[PDB]
Design an enzyme around this catalytic site. Structure first.
Site, PDB file in Angstrom:
ATOM      1  N   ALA D 161      -4.629  -4.144  -3.918  1.00  0.00           N
ATOM      2  CA  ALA D 161      -4.385  -3.955  -2.486  1.00  0.00           C
ATOM      3  C   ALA D 161      -3.369  -4.931  -1.916  1.00  0.00           C
ATOM      4  CB  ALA D 161      -5.694  -4.061  -1.706  1.00  0.00           C
ATOM      5  N   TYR D 162      -3.343  -6.152  -2.444  1.00  0.00           N
ATOM      6  CA  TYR D 162      -2.435  -7.189  -1.931  1.00  0.00           C
ATOM      7  C   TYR D 162      -0.944  -6.854  -2.120  1.00  0.00           C
ATOM      8  CZ  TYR D 162      -6.445 -10.361  -1.114  1.00  0.00           C
ATOM      9  OH  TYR D 162      -7.618 -10.937  -0.656  1.00  0.00           O
TER      10      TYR D 162
END
Lengths: 266, 266, 266, 266
Positions: D161-162
């Protein structure tokens, strides 16, 4: 800082073979190589072109070695290669600048015609690579650089399957890098973007009202660089790929596209 | 286990618009949809084809709704869409099956011709999507499926830049998925491989000695599946993409290629 | 339309081995398989878990066959495989659900520990695949499905090099598809997104003011689907990959991610 | 040929800010820049390190400008930037060398801790870029180079997700290239491979029998280059990216990996 810049980027005392480079793109790439201290060798299918080649190089103050060979000619290339390897010496750098197949609609061409392109025409850059590897290995350092067809190249018919030939640049780049990287050969590619050529000069023609040609305007909007590529843009990138500076880079496709592929990634 | 298989894969009580599906690929995709309980709606530029369409569907025992519209016609499509939305009801599934541009060499075509294809022809699937989104959103569930041109499609001229249009399937898939996924719309693509069609039937013709056509032989070697695609191969995959089974799949290109792209990854 | 939906998506009269599926993700995938008419077989390292497994399946009305085997045990798996092949019959579908390595910091672990993970732990899914291929080939149809670790899986240490093992799902998927596609085996993957599990339930905990946990809020914004994945979301997609519906799909990674990878493509 | 090599690759009369470059990788990259005629500016969170920095540069015969700033400090960086822009002048080149987050297990860290890393720590390279763009634009030429974390970097916890943060190098590279390419800014990345550092020196330790450490042996087999990366390998590539030679290259990730990613493509 002259010695530093020379240590990493210079092409001095290195023989560079750039297939087809008697005009156009290969030509301006060889031009840049020479100007970085390389020795230029190139070829073409017929003598007149080779001569036009050397003349063109000379006017810029470059002594080019020009041979007559079909890149697709199996036995021919090998001869040309060891012939270079005595007259000129060991080829350090191979620039595969291969493509532009006889544009015959895939439904017009006979089985004979397919048999040809599948078995010969598409394997060309592999043949030329194979021909120059034994030397590079001996000497302990090679650079094979495969130049993908530019996005400017009109009339190319899309044939997804042809990417699976053992010739064929994206495939070849990766296999040579994998198999021969450990003998200190670096194989990589250039992916040229929308490079302005006289061929696509119509697509830049200003309109009767002095507005930009529609296609020209598309390219400018969609290229973050906001302008077409020029052949000169591939010069330095290609040295970089041919110089000690890229020695720990292998199997990589360098895109010189003014960031258009990246715009296609939003 | 009939109820389970129906819950996830059935297209019952859902209206499906499949552009162009009066013959060929779109047709056999709609055929499969109908057989999974969908209601079929399709279009074509001229009436005769639409009729041939309905006849063909009927013989298989399918009641198809056929309209006359150019996919590229901006105002036309919108009319066709809300006209469907009363006569047939809310379009749940849109299958963009768009392409096959007037094959005029990029140097023969005038600025007028470019202005057209850049601004209209390439935006078609976006126009049709835009036309059907407001409904799908209202109802709380959409499926927009973009069918990339098959690798079988001969005569396609490679134009890297055209991937950057807002129409254009790979781009469109990703933007619609991103912007409208949170209104429970799933936008995805099918990437068909080398799908056998009567068009490319010459490329399968057996030779005078009874050996395989060279190109046919290439496709078989390079496809791990070891055979050409058939239109039927896209049927189920497309339902899957149109059914509750793919509700947490968004912005994804499903390749139905017998693993040829994966062979191109060795 | 019951017969159509059954023809393409049913798993009737097919034996499905889903490694590790005594709880969690593999479990709900097997659950979905059973409900599509599959016969479930699974394993775990120790007996107590296997039992808990069968109990859990039974309560849902599923007769599961549960064995005790370490996936990493070379000789053990082979035994388990032909033992299944008599007690239960020929394994039609293999779901590799492999991962979660002993999380010891890469600087704490001895050469012995590396020798183990490199040579054994990482080759597990390859061992299990190799063990079930001869059967599938005999019978003339296989499905091997490799489930990439979910993006939800916390504590995974990034080790780029480990993607180059012959086990290792993205590699394995592509090689099995290439080598064995022509014996009618389809090897593909599931790429699960941010799948809600009790493990990551803290990352969803509402704050003292009743606002969303920061990480929970990130996932919702960045996922176009606007919600976490649930294990159930992988059920149907996995059948699809195990059914006749995906027979011309090979070497493909299906991402069940609510379109987060596509948002990462803007 | 000195003038040619200088025209394309020289960094003379250009200010280069390389965040964190008081030791290690950023340091040897700045070292190479200086040796190509660049002016070096760098930073660190605390004074002692900065000093150790300058000392280290001086011993090599380099006058470095060292500041004290947290890369994550919003207001701090801006101050540092215009402070550089008077004391040293306009920053021509920004090398984002950002990462190594406080390694606290994602389940141990509070909402406060997440709120921090999501909103601040991950946006760092974006903050620093944003801080230096107005200048580069004014002057009419920028180079922002984002250095992905090396594959050597141990202890990194995978958080798919980052990659969707607006900071975060692969995202940032592409957006800056797209938005600011038309003001003649080229934003690109370096993707370092398995670069030998004293940290991972244990993973190279010879065994009691004098055989190669298992992991060391893996890296050598799987890297076609057949050896680890050295920090020096990133030097020239990074100049290339900072020099006129790469002016028509934008949004591209250059992988300096000895061809390991390409081996992962077989």
């Amino acid at each position: 800082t002259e010695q530093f810049l020379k240590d990493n980027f210079s092409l001095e005392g290195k023989v560079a073979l750039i297939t087809g480079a008697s005009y156009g793109i290969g030509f301006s790439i060889a031009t840049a190589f020479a100007r970085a201290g390389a020795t230029i060798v190139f070829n073409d299918i017929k003598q007149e072109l080779v001569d036009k080649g050397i003349s063109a190089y000379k006017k810029l103050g470059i002594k080019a070695h020009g041979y007559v060979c079909d890149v697709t000619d199996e036995d021919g290339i090998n001869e040309m290669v060891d012939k270079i390897s005595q007259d000129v010496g060991v080829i350090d750098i191979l620039v595969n600048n291969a493509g532009i197949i006889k544009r015959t609609p895939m439904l017009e061409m006979s089985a004979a015609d397919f048999r040809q392109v599948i078995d010969i025409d598409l394997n060309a850059p592999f043949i030329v690579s194979k021909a120059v590897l034994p030397g590079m290995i001996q000497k302990g350092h090679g650079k094979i650089i495969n130049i993908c067809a530019m996005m400017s190249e009109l009339g190319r018919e899309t044939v997804a399957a042809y990417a699976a030939a053992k010739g064929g640049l994206k495939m070849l780049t990766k296999n040579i890098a994998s198999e021969y990287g450990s003998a200190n050969i670096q194989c990589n590619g250039i992916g040229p973007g929308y490079i302005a050529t006289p061929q696509t000069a119509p697509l830049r023609e200003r309109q009767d009202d002095g507005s930009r040609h529609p296609f020209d305007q598309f390219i400018i909007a969609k290229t973050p660089a906001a302008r077409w590529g020029e052949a000169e843009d591939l010069g330095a990138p290609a040295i970089f790929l041919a110089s000690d500076a890229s020695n720990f880079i292998n199997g990589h496709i360098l895109y010189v596209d003014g960031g258009i592929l990246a715009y296609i990634g939003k």
